[PDB]
Amino acid sequence: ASRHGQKGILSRLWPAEDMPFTESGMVPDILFNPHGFPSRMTIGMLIESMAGKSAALHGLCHDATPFIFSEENSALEYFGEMLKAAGYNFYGTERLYSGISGLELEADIFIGVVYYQRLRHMVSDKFQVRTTGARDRVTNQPIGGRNVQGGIRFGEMERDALLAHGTSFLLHDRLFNCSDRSVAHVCVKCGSLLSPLLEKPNRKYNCTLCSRSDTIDTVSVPYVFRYFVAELAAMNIKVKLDVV
């Protein structure tokens, strides 16, 4: 970031022989796209470049105190006079060559010295990849953190934007085959998930409510749905489900 709110990530490390060298032999060490100025109107960066270049040239140290330079005494006039007094040009543009083709670019570039700060947010602290790992034991879903392995949340907005594509199987994959997917089995006649019970060791799940074991059939169902049926039973509510 600069001292004017122009934050940005580092996208490339440009080789030092592919950088546009100036007619003085120099070569920039920061390349800043000129399109952040028109909409953000940080005209203080364009003045800091010239002030810092004039400082480095004359061994001085200029002040950037607010409200010290009026319309009559401008900052650009002052620092352009400083530059023109060092053999550079008023408007702060020195003309570069192309470090890749070796030709003097048609436009003269605006170069200078500005003070960069390095921010505390690094990709090394904000990057995550999960394949398989821990699980919330109440719902049997990924745990949900970065210090712990943790999964990223899909979300209801994403669930509603993914089924506007008509991709029902991408939704099935994300929400069902990746987060939680169990084989809870039900009594087909009673249609109840709480009723099938195992035995004491031919291990046959037998329905407790009606003593038959030919009526039990396994169903592929989420795990939070079984948790939901259990917490509903807790309230005496019954979820009767029709198996086909």
Partner 1 sequence: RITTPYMTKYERARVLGTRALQIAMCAPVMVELEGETDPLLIAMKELKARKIPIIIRRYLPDGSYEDWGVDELIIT
Partner 2 sequence: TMGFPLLTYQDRSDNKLYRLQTPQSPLVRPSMYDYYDMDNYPIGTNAIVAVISYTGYDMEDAMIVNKASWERGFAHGSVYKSEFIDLSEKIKQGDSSLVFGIKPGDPRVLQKLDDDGLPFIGAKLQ
Partner 3 sequence: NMPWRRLQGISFGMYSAEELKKLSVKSITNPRYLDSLGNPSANGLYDLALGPADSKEVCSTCVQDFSNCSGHLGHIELPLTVYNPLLFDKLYLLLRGSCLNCHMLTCPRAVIHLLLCQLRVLEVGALQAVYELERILNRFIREELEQYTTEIVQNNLLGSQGAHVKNVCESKSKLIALFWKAHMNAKRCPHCKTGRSVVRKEHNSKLTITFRGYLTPTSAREHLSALWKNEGFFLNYLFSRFNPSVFFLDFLVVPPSRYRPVSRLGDQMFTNGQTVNLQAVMKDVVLIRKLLALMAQEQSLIDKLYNIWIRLQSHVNIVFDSEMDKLMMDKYPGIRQILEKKEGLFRKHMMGKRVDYAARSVICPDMYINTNEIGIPMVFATKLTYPQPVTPWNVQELRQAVINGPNVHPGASMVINEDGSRTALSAVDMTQREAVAKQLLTQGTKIVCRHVKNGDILLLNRQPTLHRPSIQAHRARILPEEKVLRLHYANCKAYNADFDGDEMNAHFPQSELGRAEAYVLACTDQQYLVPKDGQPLAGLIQDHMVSGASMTTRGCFFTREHYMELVYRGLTDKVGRVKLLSPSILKPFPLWTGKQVVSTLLINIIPEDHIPLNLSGKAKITGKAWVKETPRSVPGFNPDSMCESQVIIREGELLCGVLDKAHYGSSAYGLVHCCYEIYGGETSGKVLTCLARLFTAYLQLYRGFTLGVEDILVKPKADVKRQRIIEESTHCGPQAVRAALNLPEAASYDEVRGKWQDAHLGKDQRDFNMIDLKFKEEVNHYSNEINKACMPFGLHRQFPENSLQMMVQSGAKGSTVNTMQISCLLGQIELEGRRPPLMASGKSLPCFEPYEFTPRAGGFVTGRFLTGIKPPEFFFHCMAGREGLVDTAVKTSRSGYLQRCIIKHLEGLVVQYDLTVRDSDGSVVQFLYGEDGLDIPKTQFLQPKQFPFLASNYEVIMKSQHLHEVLSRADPKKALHHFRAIKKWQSKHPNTLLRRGAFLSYSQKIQEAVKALKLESENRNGRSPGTQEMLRMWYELDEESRRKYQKKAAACPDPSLSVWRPDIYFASVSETFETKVDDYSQEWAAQTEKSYEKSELSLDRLRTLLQLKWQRSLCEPGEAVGLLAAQSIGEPSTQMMNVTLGIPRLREILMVASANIKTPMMSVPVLNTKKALKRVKSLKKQLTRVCLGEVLQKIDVQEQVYQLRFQFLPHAYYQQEKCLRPEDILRFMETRFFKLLMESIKKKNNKASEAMERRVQAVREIHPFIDDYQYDTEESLWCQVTVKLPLMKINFDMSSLVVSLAHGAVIYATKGITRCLLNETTNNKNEKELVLNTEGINLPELFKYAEVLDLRRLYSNDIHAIANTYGIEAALRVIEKEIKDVFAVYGIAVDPRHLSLVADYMCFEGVYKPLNRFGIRSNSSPLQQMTFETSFQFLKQATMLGSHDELRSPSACLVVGKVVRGGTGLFELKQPL
Partner DNA sequence: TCGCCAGAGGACAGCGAGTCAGCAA
Partner DNA sequence: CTGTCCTCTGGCGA
Partner RNA sequence: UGCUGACU
**Per the structure block, which two tokens stand in for 222?**
């989420």
Minimum CB distance to DNA smaller for 144 or for 191: 144
Torsion sign, CA atoms 207, 213, 217, 221: positive
**190 assigned binding-site residue:** yes
Cβ atoms of 103 and 97 closer than 8 Å: yes
- Give the x-and-dash track for 76-115 against partner 2 (CB under 8 A): --------------------x------------xxxxxxx
Task: In angstroms, give the least distance from the CB of 59 to partner 3.
Answer: 23
CA distance 138 to 58: 69
CA distance 21 to 101: 11
Going from the C-alpha of 216 to that of each of 183, 201, 227, 243, the distances in angstroms are: 12, 18, 20, 10
Task: In angstroms, give the least distance from the CB of 205 to partner 3.
Answer: 9
Residues 5-44 that bind RNA (CB under 7 A): 7
Element spanning 197, H or E: strand 196-197
Residues 136-195 that bind partner 1 (CB under 8 A): 166-167, 169
Going from the C-alpha of 185 to that of each of 140, 141, 244, the distances in angstroms are: 17, 20, 13
**With CB under 8 A, what is the number of residues at the site for partner 2?**
52
Residues 108-137 that bind RNA (CB under 7 A): 121
| Phi and psi torsions of 46, nearest 5° | -65, -25
Minimum CB distance to DNA smaller for 33 or for 147: 147
**With CB under 8 A, what is the number of residues at the site for partner 1?**
3
Beta pairing partners, 137: none
CA distance 148 to 157: 25
Partner from partner 3, partner 2, RNA, none contacting 87, C-beta within 5 to 8 A by type:
none
**178 assigned binding-site residue:** no
Q: Which of 16, 116, 199, 204 binds partner 3 (CB under 8 A)?
A: 199
Partner from partner 1, partner 2, DNA, none contacting 90, C-beta within 5 to 8 A by type:
none
Going from the C-alpha of 178 to that of each of 108, 145, 170, 210, the distances in angstroms are: 55, 16, 11, 35
144 binds DNA (CB under 7 A): yes
CA distance 222 to 182: 6
Q: Which positions lie near partner 1, rule CB under 8 A?
A: 166-167, 169
Can you say which residues are annotated as belonging to the binding site for RNA? 7
Q: Which positions lie near partner 2, rule CB under 8 A?
A: 1, 3, 7-16, 19-20, 26-37, 46, 48-49, 51-52, 55-56, 61-66, 96, 109-120
Can you say which residues are annotated as belonging to the binding site for Zn(2+)? 187, 190, 207, 210
